[PDB]
Amino acid sequence: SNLIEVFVDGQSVMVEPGTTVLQACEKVGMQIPRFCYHERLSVAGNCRMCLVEIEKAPKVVAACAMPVMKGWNILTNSEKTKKAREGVMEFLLANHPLDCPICDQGGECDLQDQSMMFGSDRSRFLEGKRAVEDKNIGPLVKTIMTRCIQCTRCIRFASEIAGVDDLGTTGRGNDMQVGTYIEKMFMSELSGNIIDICPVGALTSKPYAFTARPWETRKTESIDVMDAVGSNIVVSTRTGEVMRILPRMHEDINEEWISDKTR
Amino acid sequence: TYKYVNLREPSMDMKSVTDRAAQTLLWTELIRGLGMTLSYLFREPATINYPFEKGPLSPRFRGEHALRRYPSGEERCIACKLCEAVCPAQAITIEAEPRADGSRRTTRYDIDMTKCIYCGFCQEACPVDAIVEGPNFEFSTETHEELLYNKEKLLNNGDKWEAEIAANIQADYLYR
Amino acid sequence: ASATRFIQWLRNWASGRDLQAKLQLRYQEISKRTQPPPKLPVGPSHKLSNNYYCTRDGRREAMPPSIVMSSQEKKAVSPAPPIKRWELSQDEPYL
Amino acid sequence: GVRTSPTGEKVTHTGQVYDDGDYRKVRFVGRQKEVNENFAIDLIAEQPVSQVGSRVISCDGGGGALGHPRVYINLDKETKTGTCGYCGLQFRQQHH
Amino acid sequence: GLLKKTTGLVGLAVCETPHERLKILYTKILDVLGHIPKNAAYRKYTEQITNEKLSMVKAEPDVKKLEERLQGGQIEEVILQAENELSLARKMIQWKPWEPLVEEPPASQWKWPI
Amino acid sequence: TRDTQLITVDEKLDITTITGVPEEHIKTRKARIFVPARNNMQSGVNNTKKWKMEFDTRERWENPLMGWASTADPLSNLVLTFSTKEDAVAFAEKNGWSYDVEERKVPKPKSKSYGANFSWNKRTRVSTK
Amino acid sequence: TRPTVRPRNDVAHKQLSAFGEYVAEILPKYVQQVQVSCFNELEICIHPDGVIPVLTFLRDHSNAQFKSLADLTAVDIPTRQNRFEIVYNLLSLRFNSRIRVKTYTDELTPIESSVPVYKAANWYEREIWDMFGVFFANHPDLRRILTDYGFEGHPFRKDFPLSGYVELRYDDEVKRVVAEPVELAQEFRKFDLNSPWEAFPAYRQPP
Amino acid sequence: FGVVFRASPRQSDVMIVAGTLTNKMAPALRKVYDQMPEPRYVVSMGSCANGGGYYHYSYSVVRGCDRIVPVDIYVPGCPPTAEALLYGILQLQKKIKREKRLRIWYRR
């Protein structure tokens, strides 16, 4: 009817107008790498990890924000696309701290995984790294902002989902910093969710700090009884002990969020 | 290329036949064997005088596990569980929590020395040179429980052998 | 090496060989147990340019098996040319 | 340091000690409880705060490649010191 | 044309008349293949290779130079393989593998990874 | 056209008596057939593509000597991978296990527009980037 | 060249592709699929009825002469109707080549024993029965080879627990070694190691 | 040291369990222990005999030869070096040197 035909590596896919290159690639089972894009949050298009080649075009386009035009062939694995990914990954890891052993995100880190799947295997950064001071925003979220990759997921979550416009970016350029700019606490019934959407260990659960690694936990899908909403959760256990509670997606109940009490 | 090991034709001339007849009747090749054992009797034996002499080892020797410290006395281990994840025998059990001063440290570090295969993968996977396999190979026990090490035992081994562990690491870290 | 001259002759004659040149006990020809520190070389991927991983990614060049026949005049062939016959060694054809 | 409980049993650096009524104290009868006397928490507190004259400082733990992964510490806060995440050494920015 | 003393392989005796044995065996193989349907691929191929090994036996009286042509090792090995080929063609008549496929596999029998 | 002779068996397929599993671990166990939920800490969806069959959890107790987590459940670590829901249900039916099946939860398509961030009269206008 | 990437050998790949068609043309009754991998290994997938015809042809045919059975094993894929995949690895000394022949069966369907073709299959098929439970018809002596006497179950099946169901212990009351249900002082720790991000796009299965 | 290389089970004084002990083999190991004249000591060599070792979690492995026979000395390693085993034997000699059978008998 009103669908248009686009090609993903040659294969034809029928998509409705306004679909982005990232969503068109999603129908044929291809997941474009991303750091800043979240389907529950507004499109930011700033990390540039979703750059993908379009056949017969000179410039790679941001897949998360570019709406797909009829007849486009999306080259998700061409050399130009692969070289675009490595360069962006090289820039993300230039100033990133060597905190993987002491970082709670180790083992379940998008920066680690997409580095091993889409980035180079070595560094050519011979300079000194950047360091940032840590911001205290309450007893639930532990901030180590030297690890932040300025993806602005937390800012857009607190503004659009939680309704609290207390997070933002202060500064400019390489010194741009995410935080409150004042000694303020980000306490909300949905605050703990900025931990899950943060790709890196910049925002980590404070109660859960240092206790377990992702690979050694057992995931049990259960339900929440702290309220009558019935949020779907995953209960992480390790050697017969409950380590933490995570959201479990359910479009019709809680999407992918849980309140602080459930968490 | 190939070669035959047992494809000779014995010469059947009278002299050669009589050479084999002398070998059969006079046991020449059997006495030739007694000569070889006689010679060994007069060589110096290769035995060493253990425990007063010890077999030679190298800095890389994989012996008893141990936990190390920084020159300040702070423990090197920051509870990253890479040794636990790599250990092919699942001999390492680790628990961790924020210490009183807020540091990332272990509250349990057990190595079941009866599950361990002494592979050394733990000292390779450690990013801070905390867990190592020291040079001691003489720690046999009289009971099974004595080989279930905990953090107190492993720290004591580090304090015990730090003088030799540091010198072995100094002599081998450039190959790693 | 401490053996007297007479005992050296007695063992050599009994064994039929010169055992003194090939002692099975190591004395001083071995390497020193403390060695100067090394400086190992780096591999061919230690370059600051013209070194994008996508051009040297072995795993990503692996492909699924190619299907030659699926159930869903010609010259006969064999899996490969018949193996060439071996040659007797010139070093020592017969032991 | 090691502080004995009210039953004569030493408390380890992890705070573990068997309660008075615990039956597991029997395993130490005729034997000893292995406790390490060098508490790392106290030892690292004896290290002086290094005074440096720059916003950012680097720590590898000493010894170059025999230390820990080099990390960079920010010293913009004057109320507290910059603590290394690996070795626990503390750094301070000189009068600014 | 001096008869070799041994074939080198244990349990493989030396054939005194290799050429006559090969003609008899290749003749019988071509005869057995006459009972297979004309369009069966086993007939077209086995006859093809059998004839060329028969031609090389009727054009080279030298055993040493016949081995260099057939390329099957010693001439006793060629005879042994000729016996095996004859034994298979006899069995292939009973099996009749030139018929269509007995049955298709389930939809995802050979799908890997799952 | 199979030469070998075939017979007819119009019976429910059941192998519980030849698999060697003790009856205690056939009748009392509850298999769970599900597609694992995405680990919410990561945005990758590669672990939410195959069907899994796990079993109900059972007691774990501390070992007196060391405090290790002991168990007596031989199926505590058993996880099976399947291509489709039917393959899992078929496999649990022939092994005699009572099973539950949960329908796959695929995220619904979303309407994404970068230009909505700068709306003129709607509420989707963001206030920062 | 590229120091770190395995070089390709297009000559061997082409030769094995041609020989795969050669076998498929000569045994249409049984061959179901033929494929050659990127590292030059040829696989012939056949109907289980074609075990003796196909193997006999490969062993005896002049252009094949696969006179060695390198290995015979099985793989358990519980998601398939026919769980087990029987793999025959053959070596041809005449042509210095290898071929892999694969068939399939289930818990109740037997397969014809390959002992008539290769005598080496005697002990390999005893191990498949012992570890996987596949029954081989007309085997001269079929019985357990690796497991203990009276051992219930087939360990190498994908639904068999790692530590089994029973464990041994000496009991002083009965003065013999006894078997009791398995209890572990430390339970094996299941690690979820898979990465949530796709690694190899070339194998992406269509949705 | 007085330790003969190989001794028959009916002349031996110590059994050295050197290697993995599987369920199939456990009954025959006990059968040899029961037929050994006293005094009889048992030395467990290596992780597999000690506590199961690399194969601790196998369906066919006895998780330690010390649940089939009593053990007097445990020699750790995979494998223990020839010197580490000799340390165990010399450690068994010191254990035998501390025995007080006659002294305990005289005080009954």
Next chain:
Amino acid sequence: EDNKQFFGRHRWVIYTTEMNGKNTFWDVDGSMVPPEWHRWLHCMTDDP
């Protein structure tokens, strides 16, 4: 030490007759060598 002896017999230790209050005149044990001398006595180094 005596370097005219073959490798392995060119370094030896005559244990003390008393260590940590224990009479070791006859009961010498390989574990009585302290770590500093452990490295030299096992030929892991050339420097005492």
Next chain:
Amino acid sequence: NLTLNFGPVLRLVMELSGEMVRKCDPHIGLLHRGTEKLIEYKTYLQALPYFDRLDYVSMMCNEQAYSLAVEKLLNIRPPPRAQWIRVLFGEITRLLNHIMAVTTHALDIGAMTPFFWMFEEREKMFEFYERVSGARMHAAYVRPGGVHQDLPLGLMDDIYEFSKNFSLRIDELEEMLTNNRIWRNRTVDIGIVTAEDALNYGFSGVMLRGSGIQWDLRKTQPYDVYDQVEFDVPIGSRGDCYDRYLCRVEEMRQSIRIISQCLNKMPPGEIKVDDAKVSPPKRAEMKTSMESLIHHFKLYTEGYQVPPGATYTAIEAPKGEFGVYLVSDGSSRPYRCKIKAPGFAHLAGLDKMSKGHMLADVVAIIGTQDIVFGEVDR
């Protein structure tokens, strides 16, 4: 016929018509440990040590077979210096195996003295193992992508000194066995195997070459750098135990020939593949680079992903063709790992080779097959 359940890790159920043997029924599984099932729960790196413990006399040859199989699926290539070390320690490991095979075979039939002489040479090759890896037997040194560490300075000199004197050690072994009539009576015409039967019964290694079959995977299907070294393949003529014994003694000589060339042609360079997504980075660069630390973290927690596929990779191990049928599903843990032990097919043929011999010959036949039950049982 009298039945003898000899029992114990080998149990032979034999029926004897007096002195002769009519049926021999080997009972195995006394050392079955489920190595193939356990590997399915281990990452590709964690599974490597399991291959040291299959044929525990030829440790580094087993490691090489599993490394080649994984590298083939990974589609990577170890650097040339790693391939010369693997061939070098491949042939040192053949000497370790053949010393054990020839001398325990001689020890079992009464000749006890050659065992001690040649085990002072094994004790010196175990020092090479311990100097490159820190372990005397189970090195875990050969890994997918190359080797673990470079040779320590001064090692190759000691290997040269060792290889210089070793040919005399073999000559002393032959002064005791080769021409000794008592040793020729125990082996000549014992366990004759015809070439056609050896192939059908799945034999490999010296079991084939002792019967005149000209086959050796180092020369027919070469791997690593075995096509860059000159050596000869011993071939027997009678198929008896004596011919196989001579073959094993001559291979020990050709190993010293290959070792002499590996030392001279040892090249410089890195020793593990310069691809940090397969081989771990250097520790020095693991503590200064973000990419190197991420890969170190992942390679040791999750391991590397092996593309989907199945391969049968075999090498000429000292006991015969040793291979692995390795199936990869695309994850970091192998789906299936069948281990093809050369002694599994050899032992299955003990009932045939022993037909018509005396009871004391079954000891000689088992020694000639060179059976280690770590690989038979797996």
Next chain:
Amino acid sequence: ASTSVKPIFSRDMNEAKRRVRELYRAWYREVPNTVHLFQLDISVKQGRDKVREMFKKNAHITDPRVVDLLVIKGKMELEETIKVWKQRTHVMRFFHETEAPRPKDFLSKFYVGHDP
């Protein structure tokens, strides 16, 4: 075609039952020898009761192929006993002499633990 399944030995339950009775007769006559060779402390009556009990468990089967495997396994089990490949421990693992009786009712299971 769905139920056109290749047989093992029996083409219908009638033939499968024939092999079961032959197997049962072989086991029934073997028990007195097993109790003698292995020097078991049980009596012949107890041994034959166990043989009877083992057959009764699989009496609900109606698939000839499944019955063929049970008979195939049964003959294999009998072979080990006749030839003395088993030992006294293997023959006595059918009786569970060291396993304390486990409660079967709800209340007794409720007190001990959580297992249903």
